[PDB]
């Protein structure tokens, strides 16, 4: 071994970034471990048919807030939106509608003593999920974010969830204009094969780098670079990691389901794509599942540290009820030497 993979712990080119660890939390938050995390993002507040915010199961939000009893530094954020969530094109449309949305955001912050909000509009200018869209959404989104920041002030968190493909950057968001308004861009660098079938669905959903098993232009690295090139500061990007597997458009499984029923079980076999830097499963000779494991999370957290990004997040905590992946993500940021040592217990010294 002449070329050891020596982990970065602190990047001397950006000391004083203190990258964060977050999880989106969809549903019952019983297993969330605050000790691992800097932030939790409740998913989701909805926009009802009258334009009003709605929280389905408020006790779950309250339970996340109560984690601040154990860890007062924890930030508790509410995400508004999600895939299929209607209401944003209308909310962004006019000075009146933007005021109204911002008013409701701040009322929600005050009601729950939140640390801030995440905006998850999927996506401005696109009706891919069935939601209303308009060609004015991209410019109107900037104005909406300004309306929100103006009301909530500088000392509350504002983030935007989005992607780093060229289409999002050109058609959905004005990256250079939203950058100064937001604290974080939550890069959902996964789901690359959502919407692909046949041979193109039998590809990685979240490969770090390109390989023969990846879709052209779709890699975590490409999305980060596209965002940086479009004017998002590195330190505002949070790199998203899926805690589920995908095969094309039609198959998803939680990490807990993969461990129980798929990984080296039921005819599915583990593989690691050393080029793309992600694991996958094969069955009957075919690519059969794309997911993240401890090794790929080590490599993605090293990418965060090496590239002076703002941090890392998971989608979602409840897909990993034992906090196996969450722990890896947390130590990948905060104690990478321990993660490397653990990995050398499986792969030998590297």
Residue numbers in the entry: 363 to 712
Q: What do the paper's sentences say?
A:
Among the most interesting of the discovered proteins was CotE, an 81 kDa protein comprising an N-terminal domain homologous to 1-Cys peroxiredoxins, a central cysteine-rich interdomain region and a C-terminal domain with homology to family 18 glycosyl hydrolases (GH18). CotE is a bifunctional spore-coat protein with peroxiredoxin and chitinase domains that are implicated in colonization. Insertional mutagenesis showed that cotE is not essential for spore integrity; however, in animal models of CDI, when CotE is absent the capacity of spores to colonize the intestine and induce virulence is markedly reduced.
Here, the structure of the chitinase domain of CotE has been determined, revealing a GH18 family fold and, unexpectedly, a peptide bound in the active site. The protein was first crystallized from polyethylene glycol 3350-containing solutions. The crystals belonged to space group P21, with a single protein molecule in the asymmetric unit and a solvent content of 48%. The opposite face of the sheet packs against the meandering segment of the polypeptide following strand β6, which spans residues 550–580. Much of the structure is covalently closed through a disulfide bond linking residues Cys376 and Cys670. The Gly-Pro-Ala segment is a vestige of the cleavage-recognition sequence, with the Met-Lys segment constituting residues 349 and 350 of CotE. The face of the pyrrolidine ring of Pro2 and the residue 1–2 peptide bond pack closely with the face of the indole ring of Trp445. Further along the ligand backbone, the carbonyl O atom of Ala3 forms another charge–dipole interaction with the guanidino group of Arg608. The family 18 glycosyl hydrolases carry a conserved acidic motif, which occurs in CotE as D477GIDIDWEY485. As shown in Fig. 2(b), Glu484 and Tyr485 form polar contacts to the α-amino group of the bound peptide in CotE. Allosamizoline is bicyclic, consisting of a cyclopentitol ring fused to an oxazoline, which mimics the oxazolinium intermediate in the chitinase-catalysed reaction. As seen in Fig. 2(c), the peptide-binding site in CotE partially overlaps with the allosamidin-binding site in human chitinase, particularly in the −3 and −2 subsites. The peptide residing in the binding groove may be an N-terminal degradation product of proteolysis.
